[model samples]
Target: NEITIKDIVIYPDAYSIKKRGEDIELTHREFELFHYLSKHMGQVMTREHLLQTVWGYDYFGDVRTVDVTIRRLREKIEDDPSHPEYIVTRRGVGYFLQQH
Candidate 1:
């Protein structure tokens, strides 16, 4: 009862996450970003790590891209986007997701 999938579903093949019965609108990069974090839940990953892994080895974007993507991802899944509980920042480090 404390858990909060709260009517969420991730279709890996479809590359989509459904939230509260509606498909969460995300770009391909954003989808990969969230899924990557979810797969490594509770483990902090550096922006470079995410850029290399999720965005791939050839990504030209800066670290701020990761920050922006995280912001967008928060807006989608978080009940309170400003005070996010899911994808949280680690200040000098990076980011991690709440473990399911």
Candidate 2:
């Protein structure tokens, strides 16, 4: 499936992500996390949920890994990493892809 959020486009099947028509390189985990968030746009997903779904339930890792990945993804996709437009955090809750 293809998902579009603002200027970003995610091609799940092709494993490609583009922003403003430019290619954005992401690691396997980053791509998976971004894809998952895009699929559930505008909905908050907890770090634990992301870890289980993206990293696999069998994979043992701290939730901080999620934060680090999100930060890196934002740096690549967002015009301003400090003020992200595509990925937004819901404070203690988690993160979500913005609808607009």
Candidate 3:
């Protein structure tokens, strides 16, 4: 099932999120990031969880991955990217999304 939020359908095929929407384009990593947060919408998904979940074990790169991905997701999913309402930062904890 495609999850529709903010007029974007996220799921199965995420190409739908790319057309006729905001000025942003979801990356491969961004798609994973958004889907994970959306699945646990309303619950704080920690930074570490995002790192482990999205990047996976093979990714020995950087945990800062979460920060970037969240920023991108917020840009696409939120009404105002600067003042994000959908994907919220919990400061000192992690991030969570308001259920849509």
Candidate 4:
């Protein structure tokens, strides 16, 4: 089984992430972060890139700003947030999706 963005069907108005036999509702930031990361699967996305991409131009490159969103994304995407299979943090670098 593959976990691709196409596998997850998102509703713009409803604001939810439905995929891989799991369906979870998300906040605006969580949805954005999920989709952005899913779209960039297999690529190691830096915090700066994630902040700029998902956090938007209004974001002032704040690393902490990504925590909450990433946390929520993990809760939704991973079987265990503490030992995540997806949305993995690369220590001081950033994060990468488990490439299919």
Evaluate all candidate structures by whole-model CA lDDT and list the values in order: 0.81, 0.92, 0.73, 0.73
1-100, model 4: which lDDT tens digit per residue?
2234534665655656676657787888888776677667877888788898887778795587787778878877666799977678888888877654
Q: Which ten-residue region of model 2 has the weakest summed lDDT? A: 1-10
lDDT of 3 at 43: 91
Q: Which lDDT tens digits does candidate 1 get at residues 1-100?
A: 1123435666778888887778788889998888888777689999999989987898877878999999999998888998887788888999998655
- Once superposed on the true structure, which residue ranges of model 3 sit more than 4 Å away at CA? 15-24
Which scores greater on lDDT, model 1 or model 3? 1
Candidate 2, residues 2-61: lDDT per residue as tens digits?
888889889988788998899999998999999999888899999999999999999778
Rank by TM-score, descending?
2, 1, 3, 4
Mark the regions of model 4 whose C-alpha exceeds 4 Å error after superposition: 1-15
TM-score of 1: 0.86
Estimate TM-scores for all models. 0.86, 0.96, 0.79, 0.76
> Listing every candidate in turn, what is its Cα RMSD in Å to the true structure after a full C-alpha superposition?
3.6, 0.8, 2.6, 3.6
* Candidate 2, lDDT over the whole model: 0.92
Name the best candidate (by lDDT).
2
